[PDB]
Structure formats: structure tokens, C-alpha cells
Amino acid sequence: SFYPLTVADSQQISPSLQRITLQGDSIGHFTLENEGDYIKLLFSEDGGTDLRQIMRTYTIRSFDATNNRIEIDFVRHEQCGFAVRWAMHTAIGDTISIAGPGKAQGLNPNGKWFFLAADMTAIPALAAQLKRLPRDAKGYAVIEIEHVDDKQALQAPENIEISWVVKDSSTNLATSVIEKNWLGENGSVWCACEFDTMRALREYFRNEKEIAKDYIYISSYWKRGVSEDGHKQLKQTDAQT
Numbered sequence: 001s002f003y004p005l006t007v008a009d010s011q012q013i014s015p016s017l018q019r020i021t022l023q024g025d026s027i028g029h030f031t032l033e034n035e036g037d038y039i040k041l042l043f044s045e046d047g048g049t050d051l052r053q054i055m056r057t058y059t060i061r062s063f064d065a066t067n068n069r070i071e072i073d074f075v076r077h078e079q080c081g082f083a084v085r086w087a088m089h090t091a092i093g094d095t096i097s098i099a100g101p102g103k104a105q106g107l108n109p110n111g112k113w114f115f116l117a118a119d120m121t122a123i124p125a126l127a128a129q130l131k132r133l134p135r136d137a138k139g140y141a142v143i144e145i146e147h148v149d150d151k152q153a154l155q156a157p158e159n160i161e162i163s164w165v166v167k168d169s170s171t172n173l174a175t176s177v178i179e180k181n182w183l184g185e186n187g188s189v190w191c192a193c194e195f196d197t198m199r200a201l202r203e204y205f206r207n208e209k210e211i212a213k214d215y216i217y218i219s220s221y222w223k224r225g226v227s228e229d230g231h232k233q234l235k236q237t238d239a240q241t
């Protein structure tokens with residue numbers, strides 16, 4: 001199933017983020033439970049959206065149940081990418097079709113404390129995880145951004161300490177996650193980020209800190225220097241280990 005949509009709005013929210021709103025009755029069957037699900041943007045091989053198919057995976061940042069709109073937050077990154085190129089050039093009134101939505105493993109709610117980690121590709125998904133936590137949840141959410149102006153107001157339980165880390169030659173998600181004071185056994189982890197940060201933090205959480213598999217979701221959302229079509233293959237290679 002593919003759903004045709006129209007660009008209803010496009011806003012540069014911060015240096016690294018373009019928020020695009022897509023609208024159409026083809027998604028009127030969505031509900032707010034689809035926030036945080038992933039969808040696939042559909043392109044032809046020539047990079048257009050008028051439909052071999054090239055797909056790109058994005059998160060539903062929000063769903064408006066009044067007028068059938070989703071917001072998608074595109075990292076303004078820069079081989080040229082299909083989705084980012086489309087997002088920076090598209091005009092209100094343009095069209096694109098999507099596939100999905102699908103779901104991924106979530107943060108285990110049975111943790112006694114919670115450790116969430118994200119880079120910019122994963123902020124919409126992280127926000128959905130924060131909204132699902134009970135209001136008394138405790139722990140950390142560590143988020144890597146490329147520019148200080150990329151910080152967002154995120155709704156979170158009061159005792160989830162949110163920290164924003166601006167990437168530079170000495171500052172990054174992996175280092176900042178490892179630096180947090182470990183709060184002991186029974187933690188539940190959710191982490192979505194770039195492939196090599198994922199690998200380092202998977203070793204930290206699973207081996208060094210002994211988190212069992214059902215108390216951690218850790219996933220790569222992209223690999224620097226590789227397009228999504230290669231990244232999906234790299235995931236299969238990484239799974240063989």
C-alpha cells in the first residue's frame with residue numbers, strides 16, 4: 001500500500017532541520033498511535049516522486065487528526081541523497097507517495113530507570129518514546145545535534161534528565177553517553193543513531209553494563225558515507241555477527 005500526499009508546509013526549524021508537512025485523505029485512517037512509526041518515501045530512480053523504486057525511511061513526527069497531516073523532520077545533511085535533495089527543493093503543492101507505517105522495538109517499560117540516546121535522525125522517534133513513558137520515569141535522554149540552535153523543547157517525564165551535546169572534534173554522542181553516571185541494574189535502553197556510534201554503544205550497554213537483550217533497543221538509522229540502500233545491506237552484514 002502506497003499513500004499519495006501533498007506538501008502542505010515546509011519550514012526551516014533550525015540549522016540542521018527542515019520540517020515538512022504532508023497532507024491527504026489517503027492517510028485519514030492514521031491515528032496518533034502512528035506517531036513514531038516509520039514510513040518510506042518513494043522515489044523513482046531519477047530522483048523524482050512521480051512513480052525500480054528508491055525508498056527512504058523517515059519517522060512520523062506528528063499526526064494531525066483534524067486535517068490528515070503528518071510532519072516529517074528532515075536532517076539537512078550534505079553522493080547526493082534522494083530524500084534530502086527532494087526536501088530542500090520541494091514546494092508547497094508538490095506531491096509524494098509513502099509506504100508503511102511500520103513499528104520497531106520500543107523501550108522496555110519494565111526498566112527501573114531509562115537511558116535514551118539519539119542523534120538528529122532519531123529525535124522524532126525519541127520524542128515518541130518519551131511520550132509513552134510514565135510521568136514518574138527516571139533516567140537520561142542524551143541527544144547529539146550539529147548546532148546549538150538545533151535544540152528542541154521535548155516533553156518528557158520530569159526525572160528524565162535531557163542533555164544536548166553539540167558534536168565537534170572532541171564531543172559526540174558515544175562519549176557523552178558513556179560519561180553519564182551509571183544508575184545501576186535494571187536499566188532499560190533505547191538508542192538510535194549513526195552506525196559506528198551504535199556499534200560502540202551496543203558494546204557498552206550489552207557487554208560492559210550487562211543489559212539483557214530484551215532491555216535494550218539499539219539500532220543504526222544511517223551510516224556516514226553510505227546511502228540507505230547500502231545501509232540496509234550493512235545491517236544484514238552486522239547481524240551476521
Ligand SMILES: Cc1cc2nc3c(=O)[nH]c(=O)nc-3n(C[C@H](O)[C@H](O)[C@H](O)COP(=O)(O)OP(=O)(O)OC[C@H]3O[C@@H](n4cnc5c(N)ncnc54)[C@H](O)[C@@H]3O)c2cc1C
Nearest residue numbers: 058059075077081082083084121221223224225226227228
Ligand atoms: C527507522 C528509521 C527512521 C528514520 N527517521 C528519520 C527521520 O525522521 N529524519 C531523518 O532525518 N532521518 C531519519 N532516518 C535516517 C534516514 O533514513 C537516513 O538519514 C537516509 O540516509 C536519508 O536519505 P537520503 O536520501 O537523504 O540520503 P541517502 O541517499 O541515503 O545517503 C546519501 C549520503 O548522505 C549521507 N547521509 C544520510 N543521512 C545523513 C545524515 N542524517 N547526516 C549526514 N549524512 C547523512 C549518507 O551517509 C550518504 O553518504 C531514519 C532511519 C530509520 C532506519
